[PDB]
């Protein structure tokens, strides 16, 4: 079987202390990245899951290891798909990293524990963000069943089924699994192949890249004579990248501080590409690929490349300070444990506006019926339209209000 990188981005959502990283470990094998220098930029893990089906039974055909000795048939497995995991945070404060991960994703995996309460505030907030940013391919997973009884787990299923009625998603598959015990993983791998079709993705579309994480490979003990370039942990949704192409990071750079700054987007050339495990020349869109650029390892250290757009040379994305948004408000607030009715937007108020991956604090200038004018403190770029989820300060930390679209 030939070595191939990620084809579709599949994420995992749940709640705190459930064990989302243990679920990722049970499916793939390699443990989470977060658990100082390398990887650390946004709260997300990295593990690649292998799907090889033995068609020489039913659900047990899709296996973790490529060599088939487990299901019964001595014949070797056939290549179907290779997937990448982008684990999103399940916390009320960490909202910008969740919405940044949702734009990267194409399919979702929901985790609800048996022993805990049925209506959870964070999972409903993740479900609302899925409905906003178009991620309808959702598989519901039960986290812990062995602590629960025979009838109580069935009653918990009935409460989940009654909860999913008014939402847009109608047909979502439900699987009972365990992370520590390691069971029924083969059924989930079967559902990933069947229920989720890969969207049409072509060579024709102009190259665009979204940077989430920042890698710097500087080793203790090793001298300055051998240095590695600043690798950007970015995700591609459109346009095929290869080795030896010019890249500009759009929003801007702070290098010089009376007067004015007149700086271009950060120019860099691709040196190395990191995909799956081994070195590869081509970058297939629909997966997290570590693009090793000429940009300094000091710039790709920690918290500098969190939600920044990248365009290829010969293309001009526009930089905006005043953005025109077409907003729609929900009935009641999602995320809070008391649920309150969403009030009308007041002029001049700080709101965390997440345009795909960019985290910006924006002030409302004019209030209308459907449209709103917003002024950004830090510049954010717009390419086409981009899916936006709005969040506001009402009670202590940030709470989601609704969805928005740029009309430019």
């Amino acid at each position: 079987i030939i070595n191939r990188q990620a084809t579709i981005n599949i994420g995992t959502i749940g709640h705190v202390a459930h064990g989302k990283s243990t679920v990722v470990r049970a499916i793939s094998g390699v443990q989470t990245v977060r658990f100082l220098e390398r990887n650390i930029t946004i709260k997300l893990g990295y593990a690649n899951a292998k799907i090889y089906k033995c068609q020489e039974s039913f659900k047990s055909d899709k296996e973790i290891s490529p060599k088939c000795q487990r299901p019964g048939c001595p014949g070797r497995y056939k290549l179907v798909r290779h997937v990448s995991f982008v684990d999103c945070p399940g916390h009320d404060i960490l909202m910008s990293t969740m919405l940044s991960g949702a734009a990267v994703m194409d399919a979702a995996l929901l985790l609800i524990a048996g022993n805990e309460s049925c209506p959870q505030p964070q999972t409903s907030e993740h479900l609302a963000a899925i409905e906003i940013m178009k991620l309808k391919h959702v598989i519901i997973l039960q986290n812990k069943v062995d602590l629960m009884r025979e009838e109580s787990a069935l009653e918990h299923q009935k409460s989940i089924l009654k909860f999913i009625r008014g939402t847009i998603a109608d047909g979502a598959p439900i699987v009972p699994i365990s992370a520590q015990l390691k069971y029924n993983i083969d059924a989930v791998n079967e559902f990933i192949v069947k229920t989720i079709p890969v969207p049409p993705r072509d060579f024709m579309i102009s190259p665009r890249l979204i940077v989430i994480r920042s890698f710097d490979v500087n080793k203790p003990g090793a001298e300055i004579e051998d240095l590695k370039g600043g690798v950007a942990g970015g995700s591609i949704l459109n346009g095929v990248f290869k080795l030896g192409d010019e890249i500009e990071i759009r929003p801007g750079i702070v290098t010089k501080d009376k007067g004015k700054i007149q700086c271009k987007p950060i120019f860099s050339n691709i040196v190395s590409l990191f995909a799956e495990q081994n070195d590869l020349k081509f970058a297939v869109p629909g997966g997290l690929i570590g693009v090793g650029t000429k940009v300094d390892p000091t710039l790709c250290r920690a918290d500098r490349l969190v939600g920044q757009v990248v365009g290829a040379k010969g293309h001009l994305p526009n930089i905006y300070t005043d953005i025109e948004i077409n907003y729609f408000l929900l009935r009641r607030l999602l995320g809070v444990k008391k649920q309150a009715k969403v009030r009308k937007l007041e002029p001049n108020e700080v709101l965390m506006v997440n345009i795909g991956s960019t985290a910006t604090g924006a002030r409302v200038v004019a209030v209308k019926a459907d449209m709103a004018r917003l002024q950004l403190t830090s510049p954010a770029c717009t390419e086409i339209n981009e899916k936006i989820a709005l969040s506001r300060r009402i009670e202590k930390h940030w709470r989601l209000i609704g969805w928005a679209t740029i009309k430019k």
Binding site: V145, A153, Q157, A172, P173, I174, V175
Partner: peptide, 17 residues
């Protein structure tokens, strides 16, 4: 969909430590 789920749950309860 909650029809093949009940067979998967019964398979899980049968094979436990």
């Amino acid at each position: 969909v909650g029809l093949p789920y009940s067979e998967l749950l019964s398979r899980f309860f049968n094979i436990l430590r």
